[PDB]
Amino acid sequence: CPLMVKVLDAVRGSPAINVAVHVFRKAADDTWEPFASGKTSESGELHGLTTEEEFVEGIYKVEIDTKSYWKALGISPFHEHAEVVFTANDSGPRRYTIAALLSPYSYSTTAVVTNP
Amino acid sequence: CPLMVKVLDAVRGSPAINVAVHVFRKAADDTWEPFASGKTSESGELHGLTTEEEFVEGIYKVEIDTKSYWKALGISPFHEHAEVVFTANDSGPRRYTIAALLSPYSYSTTAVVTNP
Amino acid sequence: CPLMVKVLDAVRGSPAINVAVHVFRKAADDTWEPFASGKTSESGELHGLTTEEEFVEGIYKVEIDTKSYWKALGISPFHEHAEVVFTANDSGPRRYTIAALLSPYSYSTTAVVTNP
Amino acid sequence: CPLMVKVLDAVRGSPAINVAVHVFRKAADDTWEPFASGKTSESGELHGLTTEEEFVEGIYKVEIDTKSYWKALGISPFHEHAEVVFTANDSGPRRYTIAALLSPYSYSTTAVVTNP
Ligand SMILES: N[C@@H](Cc1cc(I)c(Oc2cc(I)c(O)c(I)c2)c(I)c1)C(=O)O
Ligand SMILES: N[C@@H](Cc1cc(I)c(Oc2cc(I)c(O)c(I)c2)c(I)c1)C(=O)O
Q1: A19: left (phi > 0), else alpha (psi -120 to 50), else beta?
Q2: In chain C, how many domains are there?
Q3: Which end of chain A, N or C, is surrounded by fewer C-beta atoms within 10 Å?
Q4: Structural domain of residue B21, as residue ranges?
Q5: Residue of B7, B8, B98 to test ligand 2 pocket, by largest number of atoms within 8 Å of CB
Q6: Spacing, Cα B19 to ligand 2 middle (Å)
């Protein structure tokens, strides 16, 4: 699993289940191409979004639907969403893990770049 | 000042200076349309973006150019940029303070929403 | 001024009002002895803890009573309290600014040291 | 195991390897009595800190040595160390992952209590 997304709820202190995460990849036209899509499992992580061969070089946008997650719980959050825009595989084949900590009025995101 | 962005460097433990900040107010045709622009002062705070008269009930995008701040220092950051997207003033004249803590492979943004 | 302390609430998106704060400097006996106390204001801070003359070089510890804060709102937080142990005025006189973003199960604390 | 720990370097975007970890347990006579200890693995995880029998109801403190981690890298951190004081196993038997994101002048910790 080259690309991975890990999401947590800071209010309840557990994994953020069913959070719609959308992965786009840039284009020469500078428009966004829909690379992948999925929702986070009961563990709060969405692995198996892409494969080594398919995850080529480029700029990717990982967009997390935080507003929908909260609205479901009955809370109206600040952000409409939270996205992580980065340049992947520039140097070489690296395995990424994107983690995000959620709160109504704050969100935190860290990455963990690792060799295969 | 109903909208002020605050940015702090978490590696050197000081305010992030000269960080480019771009604000975009969503237009009626659903296109991100330029609202404000500026660079964080020496205190890390960027003020004087707009006024309440022209800070209408919409969806704004405060984009902080973190990539260039870090590259200037000689470091190579993970994120292309940090982006906060939210629906402002959808009730009444609220004052919005949006702050962000920066780290090369991590960052988090909080929002303090008050009113005079 | 030398020991400034802001405390935010990442759930309600506002400053944390009346959050107890206890500071302790390390005594020559390696035990923790009292130094200053007070509660955060409406703006979410306490600016009158000590003054240069009393804020000598040593090992300090700002303890923030997070437990009691979250217990009033009805919530049952994970931590008993947020602590920040650090060495003060090592490089001569400096002005410190501790800060914590509070959330039920997760807290974050940044430190900003500026020179007079 | 029932008590797992995680440290993550956010300056380099990698797991924090060889970080000292010391767990304490609230004694009966209100003093910090040693409970368990170890060092983080290649993945940044520290497992087998305690059995599913020693971890009885009490007030545990997890001290993560931040100071030496940064010193070794040439960096001059702000904090002497990260601490996580919490109450465990009062609602019954629980699993506790305790994460920490590090930066020279800022650290963040989150708890993920899972139910067996
Ligand atoms: N392989 C790892 C996966 C893992 C990573 C993080 I990172 C995490 O929790 C946090 C803590 C903080 I602090 C953050 O800012 C964010 I985003 C997520 C959790 I739970 C699990 C393991 O399970 O051991
Ligand atoms: N040096 C400042 C103090 C200060 C620093 C930060 I950085 C900050 O904003 C955040 C945002 C997030 I997201 C965090 O996780 C944290 I911790 C702090 C705020 I408000 C105040 C002064 O005295 O002016």
Answers
A1: beta
A2: 1
A3: C
A4: 1-116
A5: B8
A6: 16
